[PDB]
Design a protein around this motif. Structure first.
Motif, mmCIF file in Angstrom:
data_model
loop_
_atom_site.group_PDB
_atom_site.id
_atom_site.type_symbol
_atom_site.label_atom_id
_atom_site.label_comp_id
_atom_site.label_asym_id
_atom_site.label_seq_id
_atom_site.Cartn_x
_atom_site.Cartn_y
_atom_site.Cartn_z
ATOM 1 N N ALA A 23 -2.535 -35.164 43.918
ATOM 2 C CA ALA A 23 -2.156 -35.758 42.647
ATOM 3 C C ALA A 23 -0.881 -35.108 42.133
ATOM 4 O O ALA A 23 -0.245 -34.328 42.848
ATOM 5 C CB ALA A 23 -3.282 -35.614 41.631
ATOM 6 N N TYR A 24 -0.514 -35.426 40.902
ATOM 7 C CA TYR A 24 0.714 -34.919 40.319
ATOM 8 C C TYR A 24 0.401 -34.141 39.050
ATOM 9 O O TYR A 24 -0.339 -34.610 38.186
ATOM 10 C CB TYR A 24 1.669 -36.079 40.033
ATOM 11 C CG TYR A 24 1.840 -36.999 41.221
ATOM 12 C CD1 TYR A 24 2.628 -36.630 42.303
ATOM 13 C CD2 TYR A 24 1.183 -38.223 41.276
ATOM 14 C CE1 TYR A 24 2.766 -37.455 43.400
ATOM 15 C CE2 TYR A 24 1.310 -39.053 42.374
ATOM 16 C CZ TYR A 24 2.103 -38.662 43.433
ATOM 17 O OH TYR A 24 2.228 -39.479 44.532
ATOM 18 N N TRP A 25 0.938 -32.935 38.957
ATOM 19 C CA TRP A 25 0.637 -32.054 37.840
ATOM 20 C C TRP A 25 1.919 -31.477 37.250
ATOM 21 O O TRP A 25 3.021 -31.788 37.701
ATOM 22 C CB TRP A 25 -0.272 -30.909 38.301
ATOM 23 C CG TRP A 25 -1.448 -31.359 39.118
ATOM 24 C CD1 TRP A 25 -1.520 -31.420 40.481
ATOM 25 C CD2 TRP A 25 -2.716 -31.813 38.629
ATOM 26 N NE1 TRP A 25 -2.752 -31.885 40.869
ATOM 27 C CE2 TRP A 25 -3.505 -32.134 39.752
ATOM 28 C CE3 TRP A 25 -3.263 -31.981 37.353
ATOM 29 C CZ2 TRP A 25 -4.807 -32.611 39.634
ATOM 30 C CZ3 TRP A 25 -4.556 -32.455 37.239
ATOM 31 C CH2 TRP A 25 -5.314 -32.765 38.373
ATOM 32 N N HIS A 67 -8.035 -28.366 35.420
ATOM 33 C CA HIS A 67 -7.063 -29.227 36.084
ATOM 34 C C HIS A 67 -6.733 -28.695 37.470
ATOM 35 O O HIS A 67 -6.463 -29.463 38.391
ATOM 36 C CB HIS A 67 -5.779 -29.338 35.251
ATOM 37 C CG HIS A 67 -5.927 -30.096 33.962
ATOM 38 N ND1 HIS A 67 -4.913 -30.859 33.425
ATOM 39 C CD2 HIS A 67 -6.963 -30.192 33.091
ATOM 40 C CE1 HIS A 67 -5.318 -31.386 32.282
ATOM 41 N NE2 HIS A 67 -6.555 -30.998 32.058
ATOM 42 N N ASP A 100 -1.350 -31.473 46.739
ATOM 43 C CA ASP A 100 -1.091 -31.798 45.341
ATOM 44 C C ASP A 100 0.253 -31.230 44.926
ATOM 45 O O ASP A 100 0.628 -30.139 45.354
ATOM 46 C CB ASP A 100 -2.190 -31.243 44.431
ATOM 47 C CG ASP A 100 -3.409 -32.132 44.375
ATOM 48 O OD1 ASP A 100 -4.140 -32.226 45.381
ATOM 49 O OD2 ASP A 100 -3.632 -32.765 43.329
ATOM 50 N N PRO A 113 -1.684 -33.039 33.553
ATOM 51 C CA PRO A 113 -1.810 -34.088 34.555
ATOM 52 C C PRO A 113 -0.711 -35.144 34.432
ATOM 53 O O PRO A 113 -0.404 -35.611 33.331
ATOM 54 C CB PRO A 113 -3.177 -34.684 34.227
ATOM 55 C CG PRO A 113 -3.340 -34.505 32.749
ATOM 56 C CD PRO A 113 -2.404 -33.395 32.318
ATOM 57 N N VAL A 114 -0.122 -35.513 35.559
ATOM 58 C CA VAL A 114 0.962 -36.483 35.579
ATOM 59 C C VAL A 114 0.618 -37.643 36.512
ATOM 60 O O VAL A 114 0.136 -37.429 37.625
ATOM 61 C CB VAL A 114 2.283 -35.824 36.040
ATOM 62 C CG1 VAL A 114 3.422 -36.826 36.040
ATOM 63 C CG2 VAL A 114 2.629 -34.631 35.163
ATOM 64 N N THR A 115 0.845 -38.868 36.060
ATOM 65 C CA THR A 115 0.576 -40.034 36.889
ATOM 66 C C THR A 115 1.775 -40.354 37.782
ATOM 67 O O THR A 115 2.853 -39.777 37.618
ATOM 68 C CB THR A 115 0.214 -41.267 36.037
ATOM 69 O OG1 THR A 115 1.264 -41.555 35.106
ATOM 70 C CG2 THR A 115 -1.090 -41.043 35.286
ATOM 71 N N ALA A 116 1.580 -41.280 38.717
ATOM 72 C CA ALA A 116 2.612 -41.639 39.688
ATOM 73 C C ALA A 116 3.902 -42.086 39.015
ATOM 74 O O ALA A 116 4.980 -41.612 39.364
ATOM 75 C CB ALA A 116 2.102 -42.726 40.621
ATOM 76 N N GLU A 117 3.792 -42.978 38.037
ATOM 77 C CA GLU A 117 4.972 -43.532 37.387
ATOM 78 C C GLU A 117 5.700 -42.466 36.571
ATOM 79 O O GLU A 117 6.930 -42.422 36.564
ATOM 80 C CB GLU A 117 4.589 -44.723 36.509
ATOM 81 C CG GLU A 117 5.780 -45.464 35.915
ATOM 82 C CD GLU A 117 6.779 -45.933 36.962
ATOM 83 O OE1 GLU A 117 6.361 -46.249 38.100
ATOM 84 O OE2 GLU A 117 7.986 -46.002 36.643
ATOM 85 N N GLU A 118 4.944 -41.599 35.903
ATOM 86 C CA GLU A 118 5.542 -40.497 35.153
ATOM 87 C C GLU A 118 6.287 -39.563 36.103
ATOM 88 O O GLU A 118 7.438 -39.199 35.862
ATOM 89 C CB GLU A 118 4.471 -39.716 34.391
ATOM 90 C CG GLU A 118 3.750 -40.527 33.327
ATOM 91 C CD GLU A 118 2.571 -39.781 32.734
ATOM 92 O OE1 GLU A 118 1.571 -39.588 33.460
ATOM 93 O OE2 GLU A 118 2.638 -39.383 31.552
ATOM 94 N N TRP A 119 5.620 -39.196 37.199
ATOM 95 C CA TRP A 119 6.214 -38.351 38.230
ATOM 96 C C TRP A 119 7.506 -38.974 38.750
ATOM 97 O O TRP A 119 8.557 -38.329 38.785
ATOM 98 C CB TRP A 119 5.219 -38.162 39.386
ATOM 99 C CG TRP A 119 5.754 -37.337 40.521
ATOM 100 C CD1 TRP A 119 6.479 -37.782 41.590
ATOM 101 C CD2 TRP A 119 5.596 -35.927 40.701
ATOM 102 N NE1 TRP A 119 6.792 -36.732 42.416
ATOM 103 C CE2 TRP A 119 6.261 -35.583 41.895
ATOM 104 C CE3 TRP A 119 4.962 -34.920 39.971
ATOM 105 C CZ2 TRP A 119 6.306 -34.280 42.369
ATOM 106 C CZ3 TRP A 119 5.008 -33.625 40.445
ATOM 107 C CH2 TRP A 119 5.677 -33.314 41.634
#
Length: 145
Positions: free
Chosen positions: A2-4, A39, A47, A122-128
């Motif tokens: 995931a993205y953090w 988290h 990740d 926590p960061v989502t795909a689009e935010e990342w």
């Protein structure tokens, strides 16, 4: 996978400091904050997080990757705390300052603009994707013809 987003102060942990430890990795230990811990438990090998400099700079300068599963923190003999290994993957061409985050209304609703007091976010795909792309990470050699 995931993205953090992790916050590190350059006076304590610098960027080059982690780059020279790219193939080595460092254990994110001493996390007594349970929110950050929670988290980090979701984190696995592969990740990726944003290396954000707090205090001095207040900017995301590089991408970090988890290279070890969340295992009991060596500081705790009861396994009450856990830790993961982070490495420096590659930096951004343009450092994403907190001011730059404010310039994008979309990122203004990201946890980074909500809780500056929250270390691990926590960061989502689009935010990342948006933040990286916002930091001049537009690798486009995929086609020149």
């Amino acid at each position: 996978v995931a993205y953090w987003l992790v916050k590190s102060e350059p006076s304590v942990w610098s960027w080059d400091q982690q780059v020279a430890k790219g193939a080595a990795g460092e254990a994110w230990t001493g996390v007594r904050n349970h929110s950050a811990k929670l988290h980090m438990v979701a984190m696995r090998r592969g990740d990726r997080a944003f290396y954000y400099h707090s205090n001095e700079g207040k900017e995301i300068v590089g991408i970090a990757e988890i290279i070890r599963e969340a295992y009991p923190d060596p500081t705790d003999a009861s396994g009450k705390f856990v830790c993961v290994d982070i490495k420096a993957d590659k930096p951004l061409k343009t450092p994403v300052t907190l001011a730059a985050v404010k310039a994008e209304p979309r990122l203004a609703d990201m946890a980074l603009m909500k809780y500056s007091r929250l270390s691990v976010q926590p960061v989502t795909a689009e935010e990342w994707k948006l933040v990286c792309k916002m930091g001049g990470l537009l690798e486009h050699h995929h086609h020149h013809h």
